[PDB]
Amino acid sequence: GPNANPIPEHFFAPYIDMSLSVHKPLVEYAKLTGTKYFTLAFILYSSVYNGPAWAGSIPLEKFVDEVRELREIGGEVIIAFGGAVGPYLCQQASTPEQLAEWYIKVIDTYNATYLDFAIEAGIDADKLADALLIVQRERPWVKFSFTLPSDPGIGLAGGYGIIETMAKKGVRVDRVNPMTMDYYWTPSNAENAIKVAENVFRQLKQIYPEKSDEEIWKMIGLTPMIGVNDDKSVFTLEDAQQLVDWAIQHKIGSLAFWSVDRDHPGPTGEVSPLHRGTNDPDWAFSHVFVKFMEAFGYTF
């Protein structure tokens, strides 16, 4: 369309922390990473603006021009809410109507076609669902993704209840995107990411028993944390390659990772927003994950 582009059927849209002072133009990241799709993170409640803002108080509209320029090369974005720290819009809003108004302001500012709810903290899932019923009614072209903590012993944790609530309420669930990271008791590697994927497959089959195997895999995305994780385990470049190959074979809907600005070498094991604590060259993980899209027709 004139102000929005198609996202491929099998896509890779890694997270960019928009609040970092190192932030490059989106078009520059496209050139460097090889992907022209990104998940922009995170919108939170700003007390200063009494509404949505990046990391809870950078002006909402700051990146409109960057998104326009990315769209000029055929790129597109997913706008993400939430993340590790609150206050989330869905926590601060007193009513689902207020919450939907805020989500719609974000959609309208960016002409967004896809939203991501990265729900890590405790929330009122009923209020969220009620808000999203309003959003999908008013903005019926906007897809919803849910990015949620996971563990290779269980699949989704409390986030399972969120998806259950969505499905019951009749809220569209376009993507379920477990965060395959930070288990603490077992390492963040490809084997464990695949176990999470399999568990989530079973979880979604329970909610949507009428869906085919291929329909369920299409709903699933996986998001590792590249290189060193918060628990000192390391999701390696070999893990990336193994996961990409598995993802291609299973024809899953999407991959992402935390994060674009971490895709640089750094001192071994150091946790940073600016590098991944491994020795792989700049953009090495990005280039491996792009192979997922390339299997299914993508070229850039």
Ligand SMILES: [Mg+2]
């Ligand atoms: Mg929120």
